[PDB]
Amino acid sequence: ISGGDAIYSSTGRCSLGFNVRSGSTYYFLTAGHCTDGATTWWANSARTTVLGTTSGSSFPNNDYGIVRYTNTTIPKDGTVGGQDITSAANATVGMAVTRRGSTTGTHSGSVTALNATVNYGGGDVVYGMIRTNVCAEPGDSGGPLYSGTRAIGLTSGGSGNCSSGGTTFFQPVTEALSAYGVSVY
């Protein structure tokens, strides 16, 4: 399983962000709004292939979460679909980026602003977000935003869709890697 693939909780479906590790312990990052109130994660809608359990969740304010793998045999590719990821980097205005999600697949665009505040309402406000002109649709939450072999962010939310176009905000991945003491591979 790799970045952009579907992940299922008891509540719904999101996308796997990036596979990461700390020592010999493997995890995957995804959106905090997906990990919030979720315990177990599965690879399929039938819930027959277990992935692991939620180890941390940060939402709102931030939008990231981490799941510890408990499935010992499933491949944990350090890629996004076929694309190898070898490091993480900070987003910059004008950067060309690509997102992969379980609903819409792969879509590209550019970073249009940094440190954006996004209000999802009801007190769910997230800060320090990367603004882009990349579309995203329900199911794409938590999927990776990357640039070549560099990991950049995790899909959080926005507006529009892939047909008419939209605006998607991403959580900077560096902040999540630092919070959990994990690294991409």
Partner: protein, 51 residues
Amino acid sequence: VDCSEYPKPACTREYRPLCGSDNKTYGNKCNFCNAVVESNGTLTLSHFGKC
């Protein structure tokens, strides 16, 4: 599902589908409610889950 607190400028992108009266499956409650507002209140909820 109550959409009175909409519209909202942004929606998260998790997938928990709802079926609208227009036979379209809406990906989540936020997408659905923004569409209700956009229709000026003509769109309604048919049932939960995919259409």
